[PDB]
Amino acid sequence: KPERDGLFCARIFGPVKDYECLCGKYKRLKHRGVICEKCGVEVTQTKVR
């Protein structure tokens, strides 16, 4: 998994998997756009990385 505050930190760049939070709190296209609160990463398409 990409390490927080690292050269691949999902929080700083984006989710590794499309529309899937890093901590697994969301896996649905509906919830697109809300950052998580357990790992703190926006939920979008992976393209943003």
The residues binding Zn ion (CB under 5 A) are 21, 23, 25, 36, 38-39
The yes or no reply on residue 8 touching other proteins (CB under 8 A) is: yes
Q: What are residue 20's DSSP bridge partners?
A: 17
The yes or no reply on residue 11 touching other proteins (CB under 8 A) is: yes
Chain position carrying tokens 């690292």 = 6
- Among other proteins, Zn ion, none, partner that 25 touches (CB below 5 to 8 angstroms by kind): Zn ion
- H or E element at residue 13: helix 10-13
- What is residue 37's three-state secondary structure? coil
- What are the residues binding other proteins (CB under 8 A)? 2, 7-8, 11-13, 33-35, 37, 40, 42, 49
